[PDB]
Amino acid sequence: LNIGKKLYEGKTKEVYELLDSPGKVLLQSKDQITAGNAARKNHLEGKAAISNKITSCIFQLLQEAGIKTAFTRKCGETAFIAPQCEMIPIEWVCRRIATGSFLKRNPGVKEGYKFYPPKVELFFKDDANNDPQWSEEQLIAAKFCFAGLLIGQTEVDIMSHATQAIFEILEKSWLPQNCTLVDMKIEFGVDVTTKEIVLADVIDNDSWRLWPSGDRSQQKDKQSYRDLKEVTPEGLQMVKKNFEWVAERVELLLKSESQCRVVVLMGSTSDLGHCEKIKKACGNFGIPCELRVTSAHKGPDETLRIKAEYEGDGIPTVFVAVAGRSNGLGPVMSGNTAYPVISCPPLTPDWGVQDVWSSLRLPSGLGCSTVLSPEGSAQFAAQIFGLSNHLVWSKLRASILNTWISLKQADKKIRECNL
Amino acid sequence: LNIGKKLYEGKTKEVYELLDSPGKVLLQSKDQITAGNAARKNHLEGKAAISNKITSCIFQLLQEAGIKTAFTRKCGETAFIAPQCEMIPIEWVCRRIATGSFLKRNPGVKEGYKFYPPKVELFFKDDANNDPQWSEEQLIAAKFCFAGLLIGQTEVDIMSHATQAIFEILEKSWLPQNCTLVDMKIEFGVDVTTKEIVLADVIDNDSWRLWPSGDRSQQKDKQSYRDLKEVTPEGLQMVKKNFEWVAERVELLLKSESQCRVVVLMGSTSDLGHCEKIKKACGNFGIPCELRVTSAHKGPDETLRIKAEYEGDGIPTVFVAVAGRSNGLGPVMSGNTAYPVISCPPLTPDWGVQDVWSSLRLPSGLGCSTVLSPEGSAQFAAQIFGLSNHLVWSKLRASILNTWISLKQADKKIRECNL
Ligand SMILES: Nc1ncnc2c1ncn2[C@@H]1O[C@H](COP(=O)(O)OP(=O)(O)NP(=O)(O)O)[C@@H](O)[C@H]1O
Ligand SMILES: Nc1ncnc2c1ncn2[C@@H]1O[C@H](COP(=O)(O)OP(=O)(O)NP(=O)(O)O)[C@@H](O)[C@H]1O
Ligand SMILES: Nc1c(C(=O)N[C@@H](CC(=O)O)C(=O)O)ncn1[C@@H]1O[C@H](COP(=O)(O)O)[C@@H](O)[C@H]1O
Ligand SMILES: Nc1c(C(=O)N[C@@H](CC(=O)O)C(=O)O)ncn1[C@@H]1O[C@H](COP(=O)(O)O)[C@@H](O)[C@H]1O
Ligand SMILES: [Mg+2]
Ligand SMILES: [Mg+2]
Ligand SMILES: [Mg+2]
Ligand SMILES: [Mg+2]
């Protein structure tokens, strides 16, 4: 590992150039904890390893969901490799629950006020003035430029939407551990190579407020250190145990709590191309997808036996029925399983207007749903599993963001061809 | 006129009970101008008449548009009758252009920054603390109750949307006088009889910032008095002339700058019911609407002569063609006039799926549009005239608000039937 010059150093991290890696840097954590802009600073042994472990797990989680993130890989106990960014000097905060500075700036609001949707705020980075709140209008008027990207209305709107999405993903991911994510702070930078705005810096135990069972008095985050009247050695051991508590649970956010499976049943091997599109699209949400050939019309006995194989092994299953012309496979399956059935018929413009009604108009006592897009039927199957699986949910959530970002970028492009 | 007790008195107005009018009060203006929470106060002769005249014109304008407003009628030179309200102690501000307190609270924003859409802000009324900015969260948490109405999320969302709509109407109404409405402040109350939230207090020359030709140095509003280093008698005569300038122009906001007409051409007197619905709906936007009987099929010579009558008298006209079955009246009219033509065919479920295509699929060189709803065709005709007529525009704008308010009220009702 070919380490170059120390680029900068701050309160908790040293950033080094990597001579064998163009556009990449090494972020080495220090055994330092800090708070405020006064003398609250301490050595804390093992903090560097805890910060590194949390950020490395959280960045891998957000990256596997599809959030664009400045993270390459973990590099031992106390560092990580990242794409080099020109950091935007704004703290982006997201709140589910009103506490901390929100109450000070909004006297009359009580602790516990819930934000639907989560509240996003901006703070300009400046220790001299204790990080003052900025409006979107102030950030636009600053006309900041980083690695050649002017930070305008489009870029601010993107960081704002991304902050909400990142919060919701981390919020949903902590829920299975019976922890309430109250709020968080993140920072973005411009990747010096790609010129993309990406989540950067770290997300660690100083970034958020984490309340087991929603109970503030059980707070496990750095607020436990900020709240101390006086820092004693007995006080720092409590803080360290809180950081250890989070370090011991954070890797479980990468694990699937519940199993998911899509079974695509096709009446004919001529509709294989259409079923390959469903299977591929399921792969994008990390949901295993099996293809099976069975006809309701010509082998209804075999359809029910295949159904029984998937009903009988304890794995939650969504069936997707692909039947051309008069669809009996969706209906028959729908009538004989408690699991959901989606008809995704391979309609063409020739007879599709006529064929679709055999999926849509069903006798009473049948729940069978219809989705015409094959990518759509995978997404709907994912949305169903997202109710139980935070990993699938997070891919859906990040995909809503990324698609929205794509529209903003295409509008920005075509707007330049308006002069 | 049976005047009762003086209910309250402030810096500029005395409010009196009316013994012959239940739930109504008389707001008598005083010849006083004021600014800030210090000694800036002055007698100004004729100010009471100028304030009364402006508020009376502005309230009549907003009321004729369809904005719910605490105004009954003008009552001589210096008073007006209003429904009595329990006033909500919030100043609602709307901004098109960043100036004044927006720049102080957002250092870095330059004078002239434009808000798309117009920015709404709240200020809590308290002279002791110079009227501090409140968040929507602070107003909700105050749990204010006025004439029995709890001010909750629904009520705050309504005042916020109403503030934007009122600003946009006044903004559009000043445009024909080549005046830029920069920003404004309004207050709402609860009508003690109806229990509706309504625009109340006044809107006068102290309520807004008015720049002729967009030029701040020509400001005609009360900012001209606020800006004086020292108040001299020569200084007050300039302020008075600015107030007179606005008083002399404000009545022109009630006058139509451009004439509007809808001509509904029907192929058959059996479609008269359908044409009566278009005419009634046109009446709601204040647009005269004539009915005429002509067939393209059986009297095309007469169709063209009737067309010529309306093309030839210099009144801007939208033609609405009502033809059952094979619509030739829309197309023929569309091909022979430069004025817009709307086909509004009287479709029923029997043959409407078949008949509609004769309105929709036209030879090249025909602009003829289709609107199936008869109320819809009137609204579309209004939207066309709204590009030229601020009065029509304002009815459309207020109708978007009122419809949105209706949805919030129906959601609030059905939500109570969710327990
Ligand atoms: N991917 C990245 N590329 C380049 N610089 C980065 C990246 N991630 C973080 N940094 C910077 O690394 C520096 C050192 O981090 P740290 O020691 O935590 O600083 P700090 O004292 O918190 N300074 P600051 O964040 O500016 O208030 C920070 O100033 C970050 O801007
Ligand atoms: N329709 C109304 N019904 C009842 N009271 C009203 C109505 N419109 C205005 N008022 C009240 O009339 C009072 C007298 O007005 P004014 O003299 O302008 O007061 P002020 O000194 O500006 N006081 P304030 O608005 O409370 O800061 C105000 O306090 C308003 O709340
Ligand atoms: N961690 C930080 C910081 C921040 O600068 N923190 C450090 C400074 C440093 O990391 O070196 C500190 O002084 O404690 N700013 C916001 N937040 C987080 O943001 C949400 C809201 O915080 P609030 O604005 O209520 O204080 C909560 O989750 C904080 O942890
Ligand atoms: N007129 C007032 C008031 C207000 O309280 N005015 C008076 C008090 C009084 O009327 O007795 C004064 O002190 O001048 N607050 C906001 N505005 C209007 O609101 C927009 C924004 O004003 P900003 O917040 O920039 O000062 C601009 O159009 C003001 O005229
Ligand atoms: Mg901060
Ligand atoms: Mg930092
Ligand atoms: Mg004020
Ligand atoms: Mg007043």
Swiss-Prot record, chains A, B:
Residues 255-260 are annotated as: Linker. CDD domains: SAICAR_synt_Ade5. Pathway: Purine metabolism; IMP biosynthesis via de novo pathway; 5-amino-1-(5-phospho-D-ribosyl)imidazole-4-carboxamide from 5-amino-1-(5-phospho-D-ribosyl)imidazole-4-carboxylate: step 1/2; Purine metabolism; IMP biosynthesis via de novo pathway; 5-amino-1-(5-phospho-D-ribosyl)imidazole-4-carboxylate from 5-amino-1-(5-phospho-D-ribosyl)imidazole (carboxylase route): step 1/1. Residues 1-254 are annotated as: SAICAR synthetase domain. Transmembrane segments: none annotated. SUPFAM superfamilies: N5-CAIR mutase (phosphoribosylaminoimidazole carboxylase, PurE), SAICAR synthase-like. Changing S326A: Loss of phosphoribosylaminoimidazole carboxylase activity. Pfam families: AIRC, SAICAR_synt. The modification Phosphotyrosine is found at Y16. PROSITE patterns: SAICAR_SYNTHETASE_1, SAICAR_SYNTHETASE_2. Changing H297Y: Loss of phosphoribosylaminoimidazole carboxylase activity. One of its GO terms (biological process) is 'de novo' AMP biosynthetic process. The modification Phosphoserine is found at S21, S101, S268. One of its GO terms (cellular component) is membrane. GO terms for molecular function: ATP binding; cadherin binding; identical protein binding; phosphoribosylaminoimidazole carboxylase activity; phosphoribosylaminoimidazolesuccinocarboxamide synthase activity. The modification Phosphothreonine is found at T232. CO2 binds at S326. Changing K47R: In PAICSD; uncertain significance; no effect on protein abundance; decreased phosphoribosylaminoimidazole carboxylase activity; decreased phosphoribosylaminoimidazolesuccinocarboxamide synthase activity. Keywords: Acetylation, ATP-binding, Decarboxylase, Disease variant, Ligase, Lyase, Multifunctional enzyme, Nucleotide-binding, Phosphoprotein, Purine biosynthesis. Residues 261-419 are annotated as: AIR carboxylase domain. InterPro entries: PurE_classII, PurE_dom, SAICAR_synt/ADE2_N, SAICAR_synthetase, SAICAR_synthetase_CS. It is linked to Phosphoribosylaminoimidazole carboxylase deficiency: An autosomal recessive inborn error of purine metabolism, clinically characterized by multiple congenital anomalies and early neonatal death. In the N-terminal section; belongs to the SAICAR synthetase family. In the C-terminal section; belongs to the AIR carboxylase family. Class II subfamily. Homooctamer. Bifunctional phosphoribosylaminoimidazole carboxylase and phosphoribosylaminoimidazole succinocarboxamide synthetase catalyzing two reactions of the de novo purine biosynthetic pathway. This is Bifunctional phosphoribosylaminoimidazole carboxylase/phosphoribosylaminoimidazole succinocarboxamide synthetase. It comes from Homo sapiens.
